[PDB]
Design a protein around this ligand. Structure first.
Ligand SMILES: [Cl-]
Length: 293
């Protein structure tokens, strides 16, 4: 079945005075492919996708600051903090032109960096990505009251920080197929200590839903406007019913985004990588061979 191991040798780089962990495999030359995870995952979410790409392209998969094997300083872990560290990680590795493979909050990082640095982005593969959610009616009904509760400093912190609900419950409700105990232990490992769970709570409080927070909504609207005009090659993966990207939204993007190929992965919620890694990996590898990289 789907692989549960994480066989990658650890790599570390100092970034703004903190150590960030990253996977780094594949050939040394060529245009690298930079894989960005979101909440509440790590580079572990790419473990079954990278092996389809690493034969022919360098794959770099960092753990976001405060997550995975990266350092966990006592920050608020706002989106702006993640932007500062990811900007610096990219520079610390000396990356020039990249292809991006992005998911959930990693897609907000990737699209925001791409919009600010369009000359350095040769392609974007994306899935279950951060877009403005116009009203709460556009958040999936089965998860609406819980995400509304997450976005409070009393109940939301009790659930996410004290009780680890984003790992023990929300994560499982973002994958259609059942995760194994081994896989769950990989996802639990960075957050065994409750004091380290701040990013798990701040991330859903940054989601652009019903106009809040206004600053994130504005930032996300900006990169979506860029994406709707930019000629950058685009590869969209979507599933049914999805979470952030329902089928009808995927269809709108497939019809409207320039230079965009859309791939239906079958059943999927948020972590599409956990439901169909073989199709995502093989399609990324095929798409890469068509780029001018
Ligand atoms: Cl989130």
């Amino acid at each position: 079945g789907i692989g549960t191991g994480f066989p990658f040798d650890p790599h570390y780089v100092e970034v703004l005075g903190e150590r960030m962990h990253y996977v780094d495999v594949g050939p040394r030359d060529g245009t690298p492919v930079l894989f960005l995870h979101g909440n509440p995952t790590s580079s572990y979410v790419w473990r079954n996708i990278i092996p389809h790409v690493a034969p022919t392209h360098r794959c770099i998969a960092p753990d976001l600051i405060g997550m995975g094997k990266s350092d966990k300083p006592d920050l608020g872990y706002f989106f702006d903090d993640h932007v500062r560290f990811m900007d610096a990680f990219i520079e610390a590795l000396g990356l020039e032109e990249v292809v991006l493979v992005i998911h959930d909050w990693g897609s907000a990082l990737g699209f925001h960096w791409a919009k600010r640095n369009p000359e350095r982005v040769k392609g974007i593969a994306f899935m279950e990505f951060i877009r403005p959610i116009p009203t709460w009616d556009e958040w999936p009904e089965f998860a609406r009251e819980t995400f509304q509760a997450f976005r409070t400093t009393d109940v939301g912190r009790k659930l996410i920080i004290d009780q680890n609900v984003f790992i023990e419950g929300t994560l499982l409700m973002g994958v259609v197929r059942p995760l194994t105990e081994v896989e769950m232990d990989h996802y639990r490992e960075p957050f065994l200590n409750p004091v380290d769970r701040e990013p798990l709570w701040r991330f859903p409080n940054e989601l652009p839903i019903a106009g809040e927070p206004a600053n994130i909504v504005a930032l996300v609207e900006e990169y979506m406007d860029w994406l709707h005009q930019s000629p950058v090659p685009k590869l969209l993966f979507w599933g049914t019913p999805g979470v952030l990207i329902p089928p009808a939204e995927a269809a709108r993007l497939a019809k409207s985004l320039p230079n965009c190929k859309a791939v239906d992965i079958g059943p999927g919620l948020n972590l599409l990588q956990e439901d169909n890694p073989d199709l995502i990996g093989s399609e990324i590898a095929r798409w890469l061979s068509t780029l001018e990289i």
